[PDB]
């Protein structure tokens, strides 16, 4: 049965909040949250990974600062020997030549994944049980005024489903007023929302989840 509450931050499986800056690299940050998460859960070691590697090297279908998809990124990580650490390949907020090879010369630490799994489309229920096991990458509509200027509390709307931003759900719970919510780690810096996080109403009336949060969710698989 599903736990009534989940917070991977408290379990040491979530790194600090970052700021993607002007670069449209939300997809890379979302991907990293999920990979950092499953690696911590499987090894007990929380390591900060390189969103920059995805931006520079995962170029087959993803398009650097112009956008991308988390599932395409998971595939890249699976087929290209994992993801290197942040320290080895720091974020530049701009796309540059893929240089992880020489970067790994002096900094070899990487995290591997076996692949990824998609949460059945529009299922907040399936999303809940995926979250109960690990952080999950999701897409939402974040261009709306309400979302953009959110500061605190359980975000109830207003927002549609014009998916344009990739983030990650690191947990879920119920507010004191009885409202269920998803704990979403954003990449707009720690001064936005609740220390960089936004609690999006969970199990709302919206078929695919508020802001379309359950429309295109996926997570990485890792075992050993």
Angstrom distance (rounded) from CA 9 to CA 185: 10
Whether 26 is catalytic: yes
The pair phi, psi for residue 78, each rounded to 5°, is -60, -45
Report the alpha-carbon distance of residue 198 to residue 153 in Å, rounded: 8
Token pair listed for 195: 């220390």
- Give me the catalytic one of 39, 57, 159, 165: 165
Distances (CA, A) of 116 to 16, 62, 89, 149: 23, 16, 23, 32
Q: Is 116 a catalytic residue?
A: no
Neighbours of 128 (CB within 10 A): 21
26 is in an annotated binding site: yes
Q: Which approach determined this entry?
A: X-ray
| Resolution of the experimentally solved model in angstroms | 2.2
Please state at what angle helix 26-43 crosses helix 70-79, rounded to 10 degrees. 50
Cis peptide bond upstream of 57, omega within 30: no
**d(C-alpha 210, C-alpha 120), whole Å:** 16
From the candidates 26, 57, 159, 211, which is the catalytic residue?
26
Catalytic residue among 39, 62, 72, 186, which? 186
d(CA 187, CA 82): 22
Enter the CATH code of domain 1-224: 3.90.70.10
Beta carbons of 139 and 165 less than 8 angstroms apart:
yes
β-pairing, 154-155 with 197-201?
parallel
């Amino acid at each position: 049965d599903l736990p009534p509450s989940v917070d991977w931050r408290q379990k040491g499986a979530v790194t600090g909040v970052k700021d993607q800056g002007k670069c449209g690299s939300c997809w890379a940050f979302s991907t990293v949250v999920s990979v950092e998460g499953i690696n911590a859960i499987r090894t007990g070691s929380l390591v900060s990974l390189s969103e920059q590697e995805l931006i520079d090297c995962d170029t087959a279908d993803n398009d650097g600062c112009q956008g991308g998809l988390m599932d395409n990124a998971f595939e890249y990580i699976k087929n290209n020997g994992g993801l290197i650490t942040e320290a080895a390949y720091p974020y530049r907020a701009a796309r540059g030549t893929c240089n992880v090879a020489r970067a790994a010369q002096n900094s070899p630490v990487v995290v591997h994944i076996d692949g990824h799994q998609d949460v059945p489309a529009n299922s907040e229920e399936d999303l809940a049980r995926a979250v109960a096991n690990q952080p999950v990458s999701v897409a939402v509509e974040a261009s709306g005024k309400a979302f953009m200027f959110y500061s605190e509390g359980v975000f109830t709307g207003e927002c549609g489903t014009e998916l344009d931003h990739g983030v990650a759900v690191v947990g879920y719970g119920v507010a004191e007023d009885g409202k269920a919510y998803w704990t979403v780690k954003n990449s707009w810096g720690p001064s936005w929302g609740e220390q960089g996080y936004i609690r999006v109403e969970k199990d709302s009336g919206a078929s695919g989840g508020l802001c379309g949060i359950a429309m295109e969710a996926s997570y990485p698989v890792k075992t050993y």
